Structure formats: structure tokens, C-alpha cells
RNA sequence: UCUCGGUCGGGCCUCCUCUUGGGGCGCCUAGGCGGUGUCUUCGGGUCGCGUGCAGCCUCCCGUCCUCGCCUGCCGACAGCGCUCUGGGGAAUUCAGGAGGGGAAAGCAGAUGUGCCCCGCGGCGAGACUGGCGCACCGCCGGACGAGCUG
């Protein structure tokens, strides 16, 4: 128990904002002593033996609050003096001490880098996002949020570096694996919309390297094939559909998830006359899924649910609609 | 002889855990059973009904020196219920059984045995008891454990190694507290086959205080075995604990 | 999820933690004459066996349990005390052994002994005198 | 109570809301907590049960109410605030009734004499 | 004050806040509790009296032997404190000097001595009786419980006339006279 | 107001101002009592054997006769110990001591963010170069360097 002199530190180093925020006709006097007890009991409750990151995300919730409320009455009596640089950089060494105390918080964490995040503060972001990569190695999450937010700024090279260093990691989960194929086919499209690249061989190969991953399953090329089919509008965009398709109908082919592939295939960028036909071709393929030696029940059910979202879009005809809703009622 | 089926009371010992039962013409020595009603190695155990489920197990002193010490009665043995305790030796794991009888649900005992067949023994007897974990391996080479044994209070070491004092050394040094309590025992035929026990150990004793050690108590479990010499020592400072 | 509490608020101790629980002894009259017994296992073997006088002026610990042994599996031909000999009670099986003749000996003689010059001898002076 | 102390600063009041569940293990856990020489004088009579925390029975409050006034008067004067604030309800109003009616079953039974003045 | 620790007790070799080197070991509070009174002022009446004895007998010493006024007062110092019976001999100034003691005053008081003659078991419960006023002295009762006996009078101090205690007695011993 | 000397006081320091012809509480016993077990003496009975004589024989119960055992009381004298605002006991109040766990318990130098520039420093693609090299297989050193970064 040291805490009254180390919260004796924090406070006293508060103290010349407040000094000059009573020499300013911001706050009253009742009010500055209602702040200071508020602040000395909050910083007790941090340097408590005892503490927890939902104790510390109060307190930062406190600060922060105070700064909009500072910032919106000072508007109000158009002043333009004062800073918040003193505010942030205390929320910033509370962000510190709860990192030091617990690290092991995914919560604290993603609070502390939406924080840096809201208050412009990138090369600090990048660091505090090392730390808390470092802390665990494990969180897919962690590694998607820097990844995007790299691809975000586009620095494309740091992106596929966290990136690689996760999937290298994050063996157990197909997760990182799907986030790093979608923001790749995402810089893709980034390139498409500015006009190698040319091939784009990069979701081929890391399907290649999906194909030995511990987690490698046929749900799992269903979903990759998944966020394929998400945003067909590209150039080899059929290549890589039709190799997706041709690999896991050599690995995995009579499974339902290969006959739904089959089926949901020549849908790539379809929305319009091409859309009726192609929606033909892939019934065709439906029924002889169906009538095909497969598991019924686990096709049905993929296509009970694919059908599900075709429903939810709008715009068809319908004699259209109700033969669907007929295929659907015979499963 | 000390017959089976006979009527004898039990009384707590000195040292925790062990409790001695006597009775009739016969004084023996004795401990908590973790496992109730089942024997380790034909060991002879007692049922007592309390106003069922708890039994005890006797010790053959002429089967495990350690037995044999307390009998000559040292000081303190520094294992009591709940202190971390790493043995060297463990072989086949009868004592060992009794010693992890001692440090009960709440402590634990890390073993080592070295040969395969006799760990075999071990890993039963680990399956059966959930308080010792055993470590087949080679002891000289603590590195080969340093993942899987943390820091232990209390070593007990009875390997028949002519380099144990250095063998001690280096498993004190990556695994025991300041603070640390040993037993080791000495076979001067092991050791030294020519020279007089009693010199041989002294010498082992100076190699100890070499490896940082402080003697404090020292003798001949003469009645239940010959040429051993049982040594009960500190690492690293002087008072037992801390 | 969260109810209310019970109410339960309202000398030396009774079992033993650092002994995983002996209780402390209840004190039947035939515990105690089995404690008796046991300080005098001394005289039980007729010199056939001294053991080392462990003998306090109170000869009851604090803390015990009647026991007995269960089996041992490596000697079962004779290690291993028959039906008709498993008694209840430790005196009950000194009483069942032998040289409970020897025990009678030895008492008379004791008797003998302290009956030397005490009373009935001087009673018998007294009375060859008077005659 | 944790907040404003409300067993230590409307000591009568909460009592006397609680007195209608007598038998029930809220009732006891607050007779714990209940800081003694605060209980009201009425109430005092309560003591022993907190010394020896089961819950006292109705006839045993119905003996004190019978014995003194201040009571009665005071669980009357109590849940008559409730009805005439309308929050009134089955259960503390049945309470009241078999209260009220057995302790002036008990008081007549006392206040008989025999000697005219006294009986009137 | 907590046991100082060790570089603090180093510092404060000479702080203690119970023995004052002018509480004299308390020698003041260890008798006045043994022997049971009850004003510490009259412990230290009692006490400048023994003084006042002493520097007669250093002084007396200081004379020369040979002196007639010395031979007699030698003589009626000793023979009169020894009536006082606070001595044990009459023949040695040397026993007046490094013998004659507030301690010996306390244990002629009347209390004590009732305690020796036997009166009641503890002095205490000796001090008990004679403030309820059992104990007579003469013919007159006692009240005050710092009467000190001298010796002539130890041989009379016994109990009063109408005695629930006598009565006891007298119970006991089986002659209960009710006359 | 710079020293100096002397002085029946004090401060300071010392050893007395306690170790009692005393009291309480214990140990220790000569032994009294209660519980209670023998041995002697006979008498009654009892399991059975025998010849069912005579006897023999197990067991019990009572008398006589003494002796002994019990963490059981009490226990005279004398001897010893402890301890004396007497000795117990319970609540309750304050003043310390000793030990067991539980507790990230963690203020070595506590500087808003972002930019650029300068200075310095690191990585760092790539490009040279000196001499050495009687196991001959390669060393070690200078000084350029895109790009990145502190």
C-alpha cells in the first residue's frame, strides 16, 4: 500500500489544467472541487490492489467525457485558448498503467486502439497494436483490425506482413485465412479500379497452402469459395472459380458442399437477361445434385439455405418464385 | 509377527502427516491414504471406521530409506502437507507412493526414474494417485524436464549415482526456492567403494557446502541399512523456510 | 441467481487439519484401559521383548483413532489372525494368548512378597505369644 | 440499506413492513443485520430471537401487542398510512385484522375486574 | 510503540517510555502493591522517615567509637526500633544501616501483621475486614489500615465484641456461645 | 562582555530505598475413603466324567482372611518449586509480540498528437577493395551503397 503517494503523483500532476480552468470562467469553484474529488477517487480505484479492466475502461470513459463536455462549453463560450493535448495524454498514460497491469484483455486492448484511433494518433497505434499482437498471438480479431486497417491506409506490404505473420500463427482457424484472401481480393479490385497482378495467383496459392492447413475441411473450401463469390465484378475471377471448384471436386467430390459449389458456380457476377439463364443452367445443376448420390439432407439443407438469401433479395418473377418455393417445400 | 486383522490405535507423529500406529506387541509407521482400500505394492494397510472411507497405509522401513530416517528420528523433513516436493530416484515408486501420500490432495510430488520398466510402475502408480506426477528421463539432465517440473520446496534425492553431488547441484540450482529443504541419501559403497564411511561422508558433505548447501542434520539409518548415511540440508541460507 | 443469505453467526480444536483429521479421542472406559495396556506393553512380553519406556505421567494423547490391519497380500497362511482369534479388543487378545498363567504366577508372588511382614504375620506372633 | 441505512435511520418503519412476513428467511436475515439500541421501544421485544436467530412466532407477537399499547397502536398506525395511501393489499391486511382482533380478544381479557369501577 | 526495529533501536539506546531512571526502578509501585496500601504519599512518608533514620545511623558511625553519647544512643536507637519491631536484633548498627527499610515498616503495619498472626488468609481480604471494622486494637476499634503495630501490640489486636467473624470462629470450634 | 578559580544545593551518574521470622498455589509422601482384583477358609450350587459308590472335575455365588491396583478424591509434618494489588473462571476494552496463508504486491528517473526538415544512428538490396592464406579449405579488414527506420 502505497496508493494515497502514487495518486498524490496523478493528481498533482493534473493540477495546473484545473489551475487554469479556474482562472477561466469555465467551471466554478463548487464544480472544480466536485472534479477534483471525483478524479482522486477514480485514481484510488485504479492503484487499488484489486482492480479490473472494467474499473479501468470507467475511468478512461470519465476522462474522456470530460474532455467533450470541456470542448463543448468552451464552444459555447467561444474560447479557443485551451487545449485537450493534457487530457489525452493522461488518458494516455491510464490507457499505460492498464496495459502494465493487465495485458491479457482483448477488451482493454480494442478500447485502447479505437481511442488512439478516434484521436489520430497512427504511428502510436501501430506501436500499441505490437504490443498487444505480441500479447497474444492467437486473436484472429487482432490480426484482421490491423491488417484492414493497413489495407485501409493502404500500405499493402505491412498489411500482407501481419498478415503472413498471423496465418503463420492462427493455424487452428480457417478465420485469418478467409480476412487475408478477402482484403487481397479487396486490393484487386483496388488495382481494377485504378486502371503478378495481371495473374493475381495470390488466393490460388493461399487455397494451395489451405489445402494442407490442420483445419482444412470441406466447410472450409465452402466458405472460401464463399468470399470468392463475393464481389465477382474482377478479371480471373472465373479462373479462380473454376480452380476452386475443379480442386475440391478432385479432394472432396461427392460432398454436398463440392455439389453445392457445383451448382452455385457460373453465379459470379450476376445481377438483366443474363440472370435468368444463368439461374437455369444452375438449376439444372440443382437437380442433378439432387437426384445425384449425396447426402439429401445436408445438400437440402445448404440449398434451403441458399435459397434463404435468394429469397431475401428482391426483383424476380413470379412463376419463378414459386417453383422455388415448390423445390424448397419437396426437401 | 505383526499379523493381520489385529486391533492397533493410531496417533499423529512429529512430523505432519505421518502418524504412527501401535498397538499389542508391535509400533509401526504409517500414513493417509489418498486412495482408500487399495494397496500399492502388497503394501499392508489399516481400515479404521470413523463415526468407512478412511485408511492408512504402513511403511516397510526396510524397504524405503526414507522410512528408515524418520525411524532414526531427523529433525525435520521439511515435506509438509501442501510443500512442492521433487524427488530423484523414482524407483518404481513406492516410496514415492508414501511420499505423496504425505503431501496429500493439495500438494504434489514430481518424479524421475531413468530406466523404462520401472517407470512403467510409476506411470501406474501416477494413474492411480493424482498428486505425483512422474518425469521419466535422465536426472543428470535437468534441461530434459525444466518445462514440466516448477519450483519445489523439498528435494528428496536417493539415486545410487557416483556424481550425485553434482547430479544435486545442478537440480537444486534450476528448481529449488531460497530456502530450499533437501534430503539426500549415501550409499559410501556407491560412492567410494574403499574408503571408510563415515570420511566418505564427510567428503560429501563438503561437496554439498561446494554447491552452496549448509548441512544441519546428518545419520546412519544404522539399524535398517548398512553404510547409508541420511543428510538433511539447506540451500541457500539457514533457517528452513523463509 | 442471487438469494438471499442464510443467517448462522451464532475453545481448543476438535479435528486436525495438519493431520488430515484425527478426531479428538472420545474416552471410552475400555479406550482407556486399552491405553493402559499399551504404556504397559513393557510388562505384556514376560522380558521377552523391552521397548523404549515412553512414558509420560499422562499416558493419553490428545488425539487418536482405534484401528485395525487389513490384509497382506504377500502372507496369507499365517499372517493373518483366524476367525476365532479376531477379538474386538487389544485386551481382549492378550487375554487370548497364552502365559496369562505366567501373568497369575508372577502376581502371586508379588503377592506373597508384599503379604511378607505386613499384618497377618505379626497376628500370628501375637498369638503364639498369647498361648 | 447498504446506501442510506435505512435499518439504522427508519428503524420503525422497515420493521414495521417486514413485521407482516414474519416467518420468512428475509425476516430473520434483517433481524441480523438490525442495529440493537436503534429498534424502536415497541419493538424491543425482539432481542432474545436476535440473540438466538430463528424468527419469532405470531403468538408471541400477539403477547406483546395484547401486553402494551404502544404496539398496537403503532402496527394500526402503520398500515392505516397505507391505506390511506392506497397501496394497501391482501396479504397486510389480513395480518393486521388477525393481529388487531386477537390482541383485543387478550386485552378484554385482561381489563375484566369483577370490581364495577374498575370494568368501566 | 511498536518493538523499535534494529538501526531504530540503535538510535534509541537510551529511549524508554516505562523505566525512568527517576521512577527508580519503580521500587515505589513493586512494594506499595506487595504489601497492599493505599496512599503512595504515605508510601513516601514512610519513606523520608527511613531516610532520616539513615543519616542518624551514618552519622552515628561517623562519631568516634569510643564515645560515651555514641555507646548510648547505639543503644537507644536499636532497642527502640527494635520495640518498634521493625529490626530483627538489637546489637548491630550495621543491620540499622543497610537493614532498616520501608519494606520492614509495611510489614509491621497492621494488615500484615494481622496476616502473620493469622487473623485471615490474604492480606487483601485482611484489608477487606478491617475496613468493614472487625479488628480491635486495646479496647478501641481500628478503622485506619496503616496503624502500625509496634510490637507490644501485636500481642492484643484481636476481634471485636459483637463479630459475625468471632461468631464464625466460635461456630467452627463448636462452642458457640449464644451468652 | 572575553576568560579563570572556588563553593554543604541541583541537573547527571551511582548503590541502597525489594529479596519479608510472612502469605497463596502446586510437587512430594505416612495414609484415610470410593471404585475394585486377587490369595487363604469353608459352605451352598453348577458342566461333565467316573464305579454313577467312593470320588474326580468345570464354572458360579456367599463367609473368613488379609494384600494389591486405580492419570479417582482428600491427604498431617518436613523438604522443594512457582508466585504474591492472593489463586481460578466467563464476558468485554485496550497495549504489544510470534507465526500461517491470501494480494502483480510492480512510481530508476513519470515530458500531448501529427508533420516535415536538419543532425546522429541503425537495419538493409546491391556493388567494390586491401593484405593474409608451405593440411589450402578460405579468412579478416577498409569504404560505397538504392530502399526502410529510430
Keep these: 500500500a502505497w496508493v494515497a503517494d502514487k495518486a498524490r503523483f496523478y493528481l498533482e500532476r493534473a493540477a495546473p489544467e484545473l489551475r487554469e480552468w479556474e482562472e477561466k470562467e469555465i467551471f466554478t469553484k463548487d464544480e472544480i472541487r466536485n472534479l477534483v474529488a471525483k478524479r482522486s477517487d477514480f485514481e484510488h480505484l485504479v492503484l487499488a490492489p484489486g482492480t479490473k479492466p472494467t474499473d479501468f475502461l470507467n475511468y478512461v470513459n470519465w476522462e474522456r467525457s470530460l474532455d467533450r463536455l470541456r470542448a463543448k462549453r468552451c464552444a459555447r463560450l467561444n474560447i479557443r485558448s485551451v487545449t485537450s493535448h493534457a487530457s489525452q495524454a493522461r488518458t494516455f498514460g491510464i490507457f499505460e498503467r492498464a496495459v502494465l497491469k493487465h495485458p491479457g484483455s482483448i477488451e482493454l486492448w480494442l478500447a485502447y486502439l479505437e481511442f488512439a484511433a478516434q484521436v489520430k494518433a497512427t504511428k502510436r497505434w501501430r506501436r500499441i497494436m505490437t504490443r498487444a499482437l505480441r500479447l497474444h498471438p492467437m486473436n484472429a480479431s487482432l490480426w484482421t483490425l490491423a491488417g484492414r486497417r493497413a489495407a485501409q491506409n493502404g500500405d499493402m506490404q505491412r498489411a500482407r506482413a501481419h498478415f503472413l505473420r498471423g496465418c503463420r500463427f492462427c493455424t487452428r482457424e480457417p478465420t485469418l485465412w478467409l480476412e487475408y484472401a478477402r482484403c487481397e481480393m479487396d486490393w484487386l479490385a483496388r488495382m481494377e479500379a485504378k486502371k503478378p497482378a495481371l495473374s493475381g495467383a495470390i488466393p490460388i496459392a493461399v487455397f494451395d497452402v489451405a489445402r494442407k492447413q490442420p483445419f482444412w475441411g470441406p466447410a472450409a473450401a465452402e466458405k472460401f469459395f464463399d468470399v470468392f463469390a463475393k464481389f465477382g465484378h474482377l478479371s480471373c475471377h472465373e479462373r479462380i472459380i473454376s480452380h476452386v471448384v475443379t480442386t475440391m471436386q478432385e479432394l472432396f467430390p461427392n460432398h454436398p458442399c463440392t455439389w453445392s459449389v457445383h451448382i452455385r458456380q457460373p453465379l459470379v457476377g450476376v445481377d438483366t437477361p443474363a440472370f435468368p439463364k444463368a439461374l437455369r443452367e444452375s438449376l439444372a445443376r440443382l437437380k442433378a445434385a439432387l437426384q445425384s448420390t449425396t447426402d439429401r439432407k445436408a445438400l437440402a439443407t445448404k440449398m434451403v439455405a441458399w435459397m434463404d438469401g435468394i429469397l431475401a433479395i428482391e426483383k424476380l418473377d413470379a412463376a419463378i418464385r414459386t417453383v422455388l418455393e415448390h423445390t424448397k417445400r419437396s426437401l | 509377527g505383526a499379523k493381520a486383522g489385529k486391533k492397533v490405535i493410531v496417533e499423529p507423529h512429529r512430523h505432519k502427516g505421518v502418524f504412527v500406529a501401535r498397538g499389542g506387541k508391535e509400533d509401526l509407521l504409517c500414513t493417509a491414504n489418498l486412495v482408500p482400500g487399495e494397496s500399492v505394492y502388497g503394501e499392508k494397510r489399516i481400515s479404521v471406521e470413523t463415526p468407512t472411507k478412511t485408511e492408512y497405509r504402513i511403511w516397510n522401513p526396510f524397504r524405503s530409506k526414507l522410512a528408515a530416517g524418520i525411524l532414526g528420528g531427523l529433525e525435520t523433513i521439511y515435506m509438509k502437507p501442501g510443500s512442492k516436493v521433487l524427488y530423484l530416484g523414482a524407483a518404481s515408486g513406492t516410496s514415492v507412493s508414501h511420499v505423496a501420500d504425505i503431501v496429500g490432495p493439495t500438494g504434489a510430488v514430481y518424479a524421475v526414474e531413468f530406466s523404462h520398466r520401472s517407470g512403467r510402475d510409476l506411470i501406474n502408480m501416477a494413474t492411480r494417485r493424482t498428486n505425483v506426477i512422474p518425469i521419466v528421463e535422465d536426472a543428470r539432465k535437468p534441461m530434459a524436464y525444466r518445462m514440466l517440473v516448477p519450483m519445489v520446496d523439498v528435494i528428496f534425492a536417493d539415486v545410487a549415482q557416483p556424481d550425485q553431488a553434482r547430479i544435486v547441484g545442478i537440480n537444486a540450482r534450476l528448481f529449488l526456492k531460497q530456502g530450499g529443504g533437501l534430503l539426500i541419501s549415501i550409499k559410501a559403497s556407491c560412492i567410494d567403494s574403499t574408503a571408510p564411511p563415515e570420511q566418505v561422508f564427510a567428503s560429501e558433505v563438503q561437496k554439498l557446502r561446494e554447491d552452496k548447501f549448509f548441512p544441519k542434520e546428518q545419520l546412519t539409518l544404522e539399524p535398517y541399512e548398512r553404510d547409508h548415511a541420511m543428510v538433511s540440508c539447506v540451500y541457500l541460507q539457514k533457517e528452513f523456510e523463509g | ?131 | 440499506i447498504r446506501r442510506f441505512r435505512i435499518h439504522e435511520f427508519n428503524t420503525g418503519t422497515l420493521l414495521a413492513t417486514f413485521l407482516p412476513y414474519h416467518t420468512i428467511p428475509a425476516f430473520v436475515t434483517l433481524l441480523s443485520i438490525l442495529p440493537v439500541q436503534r429498534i424502536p421501544i415497541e419493538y424491543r421485544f425482539l432481542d432474545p430471537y436476535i440473540k438466538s436467530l430463528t424468527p419469532p412466532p405470531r403468538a408471541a407477537i400477539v403477547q406483546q401487542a395484547t401486553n402494551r399499547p404502544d404496539l398496537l397502536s403503532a402496527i394500526s398506525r402503520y398500515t392505516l398510512d397505507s391505506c390511506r395511501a392506497k397501496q394497501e393489499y391482501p396479504g397486510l391486511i389480513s395480518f393486521w385484522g388477525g393481529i388487531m382482533a386477537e390482541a383485543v380478544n387478550g386485552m378484554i381479557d385482561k381489563m375484566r375486574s369483577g370490581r364495577r369501577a374498575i370494568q368501566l | 510503540v511498536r518493538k523499535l526495529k534494529y538501526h531504530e533501536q540503535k538510535l534509541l539506546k537510551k529511549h524508554d517510555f516505562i523505566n525512568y531512571k527517576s521512577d527508580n526502578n519503580h521500587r515505589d509501585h513493586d512494594v506499595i502493591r506487595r504489601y497492599m496500601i493505599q496512599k503512595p504519599e504515605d508510601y513516601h512518608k514512610y519513606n523520608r522517615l527511613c531516610g532520616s533514620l539513615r543519616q542518624f545511623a551514618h552519622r552515628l558511625s561517623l562519631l568516634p567509637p569510643d564515645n560515651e553519647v555514641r555507646r548510648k544512643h547505639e543503644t537507644l536507637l536499636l532497642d527502640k526500633l527494635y520495640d518498634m519491631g521493625i529490626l530483627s536484633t538489637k546489637a548491630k548498627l550495621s543491620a540499622v544501616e543497610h537493614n532498616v527499610t520501608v519494606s520492614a515498616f509495611a510489614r509491621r503495619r497492621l494488615p500484615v501483621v494481622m496476616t502473620r498472626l493469622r487473623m485471615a488468609e490474604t492480606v487483601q481480604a485482611a484489608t477487606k475486614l478491617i475496613e468493614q471494622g472487625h479488628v480491635r486494637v486495646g479496647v478501641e476499634e481500628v478503622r485506619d489500615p496503616a496503624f502500625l503495630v509496634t510490637r507490644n501490640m501485636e500481642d492484643f489486636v484481636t476481634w471485636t465484641v459483637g463479630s459475625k467473624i468471632k461468631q464464625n470462629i466460635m461456630k467452627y470450634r463448636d462452642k458457640l456461645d449464644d451468652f
Excluded at chain 3, 64 to 78: F, M, N
Excluded at chain 3, 87 to 109: A, C, F
Aim: include cysteine.
Design chain 3, 1 to 131: 441467481e442471487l438469494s438471499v443469505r442464510v443467517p448462522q453467526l451464532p475453545g481448543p480444536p476438535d479435528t486436525l487439519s495438519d493431520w488430515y483429521n484425527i478426531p479428538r479421542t472420545n474416552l471410552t472406559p475400555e479406550l482407556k484401559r486399552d491405553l493402559q495396556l499399551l504404556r504397559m506393553r513393557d510388562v505384556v512380553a514376560m522380558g521377552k521383548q523391552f521397548f523404549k519406556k515412553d512414558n509420560r505421567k499422562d499416558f493419553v494423547p490428545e488425539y487418536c483413532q482405534v484401528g485395525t490391519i487389513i490384509a497382506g497380500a504377500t502372507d496369507g497362511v499365517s499372517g493373518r489372525l483366524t476367525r476365532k482369534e479376531r477379538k474386538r479388543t487389544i485386551v481382549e487378545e492378550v487375554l487370548s494368548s497364552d502365559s496369562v498363567s505366567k501373568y497369575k504366577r508372577k502376581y502371586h508372588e508379588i503377592q506373597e512378597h508384599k503379604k511378607s511382614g505386613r499384618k497377618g504375620y505379626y497376628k500370628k506372633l501375637m498369638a503364639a505369644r498369647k498361648r
